[PDB]
């Protein structure tokens, strides 16, 4: 039951660094990698006392992979897995998809096939990127298309980071995200959702971090990833692997852009006094001020929830919490969906890290939500795409690199079809 992890771009290969920092301690593996079969789904034991991750980090520029190559985990990965190019896509979907992409994707796919052949019980792929960039968007599309044409019938989990309405660090990122969604709609299988602004807000409020940097963001995204993947590693009461996810949560092949939430995230100064039993952690998982995507889901109707509980959690109290949720008046599911919950329970409480920020909490909850409200991000992206594109701004870079007006128009109209489909399914 193995799943392999691929990281593309700055955001991807930093979130991966956070994830491996988490997993090494979660399984007891020392930095270089030893122990002084839960690991079998992420590491592959080779030789006497040596475990290598089932990942591949890659990027078109080497200044971001060099610190991974020479850092505190220089002894962890296979020295051939930390792929790197020479010139980055330079915030250009076109550049990273048409003239720099066609060099490194072949090597990446060769190593991917090598890892797949080393695997024995392949469950799926899980990739990391932020579609607002160039080497994220273009290279992720170019790599996902080949991965799908190779494997096709195996799950893919893109943990993508869209841009935020007002917290943004680029001008061509609307073009990048629009041109990436046209392919992430069709090639991936489940698109887990993150935003930088929503995580900033949750850091500001729940963790009372006045000035949060990327370290905390990655450190609390890795925990969500571990929570939704811990079913394979640790045997619990109710077991859910990747297959049940996209069979309980995806009603139509075009609605797989699902929000993610987690509760609780309470600092060690409030965890002593806090009451973190199951009912209240569920009620705090379903609150809008704790969802990692900058959206107001109360504007829309839910379609499918997936609640992964970890720790000292029994089944009937989660059933009762679900009862309270479905009796509440402010949140409502679509008419055709009487039951809309998938509850799984695991016996391993979340793991903390030395030098970290969270607390050694007894129980926790991760949540994956498929709801109609997610179309607001797409509508906003369409609007702030067309605002620039009405004057042909920044199109000269893409055109000179090798794109054309037709691709832009077709991506925009595909996003329009997606918005109309969301409005139809919200009826």
């Amino acid at each position: 039951r193995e799943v392999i992890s691929i990281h593309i771009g700055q955001a991807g290969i930093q979130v991966g660094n956070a994830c491996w920092e988490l997993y090494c301690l979660e399984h007891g593996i020392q930095p270089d990698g030893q122990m002084p079969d839960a690991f079998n789904t992420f590491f592959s034991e080779t030789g006497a006392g040596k475990h290598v991750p089932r990942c591949i980090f890659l990027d078109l520029e080497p200044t971001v992979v060099d610190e991974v190559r020479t850092g505190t985990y220089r002894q962890l990965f296979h020295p051939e897995q930390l792929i790197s190019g020479k010139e980055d896509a330079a915030n250009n979907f076109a550049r990273g998809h048409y003239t720099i992409g066609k060099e490194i994707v072949d090597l990446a796919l060769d190593r991917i096939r090598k890892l797949a052949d080393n695997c024995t019980g392949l469950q799926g792929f899980l990739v990391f990127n932020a579609v607002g960039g160039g080497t994220g968007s273009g290279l992720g599309s170019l790599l996902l298309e080949r991965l799908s044409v190779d494997y096709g019938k195996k799950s893919k989990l893109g943990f993508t980071v869209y841009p935020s309405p007002q917290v943004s660090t680029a001008v061509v990122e609307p073009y990048n995200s629009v041109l990436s969604t046209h392919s992430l709609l069709e090639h991936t299988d489940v698109a887990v959702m993150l935003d930088n602004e929503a995580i900033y807000d949750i850091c500001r409020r729940s963790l009372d971090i006045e000035r949060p940097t990327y370290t905390n963001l990655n450190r609390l995204i890795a925990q969500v990833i571990s929570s939704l993947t811990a079913s394979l590693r640790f045997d619990g009461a109710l077991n859910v692997d990747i297959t049940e996810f996209q069979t309980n949560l995806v009603p139509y092949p075009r609605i797989h852009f699902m929000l993610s939430s987690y509760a609780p995230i309470i600092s060690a100064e409030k965890a002593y006094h806090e009451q973190l039993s199951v009912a209240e952690i569920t009620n705090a998982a379903f609150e809008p001020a704790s969802m990692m995507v900058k959206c107001d889901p109360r504007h829309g109707k839910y379609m499918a929830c997936c609640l992964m509980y970890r720790g000292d959690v029994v089944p009937k109290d989660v059933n009762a919490s679900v009862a309270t949720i479905k009796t509440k008046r402010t949140i409502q599911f679509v008419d055709w969906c009487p039951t809309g919950f998938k509850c799984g329970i695991n016996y391993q409480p979340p793991t903390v890290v030395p030098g970290g920020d969270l607390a050694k909490v007894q129980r926790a909850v991760c949540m994956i939500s498929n709801s109609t409200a997610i179309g607001e991000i797409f509508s906003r992206l369409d609007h702030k795409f067309d605002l620039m594109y009405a004057k042909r701004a920044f199109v000269h870079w893409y055109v000179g690199e090798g794109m054309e007006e037709g691709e832009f128009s077709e991506a925009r109209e595909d996003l329009a079809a997606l918005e109309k489909d969301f409005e139809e399914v919200g009826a």
Partner: peptide, 22 residues
């Protein structure tokens, strides 16, 4: 124009491969 021709040929060949894939 020569480099544009090269890029157009590459893109159209990959497009044909994609169409055959679909």
């Amino acid at each position: 124009d020569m480099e544009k021709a090269l890029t157009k040929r590459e893109i159209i060949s990959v497009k044909g491969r994609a169409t055959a894939a679909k």
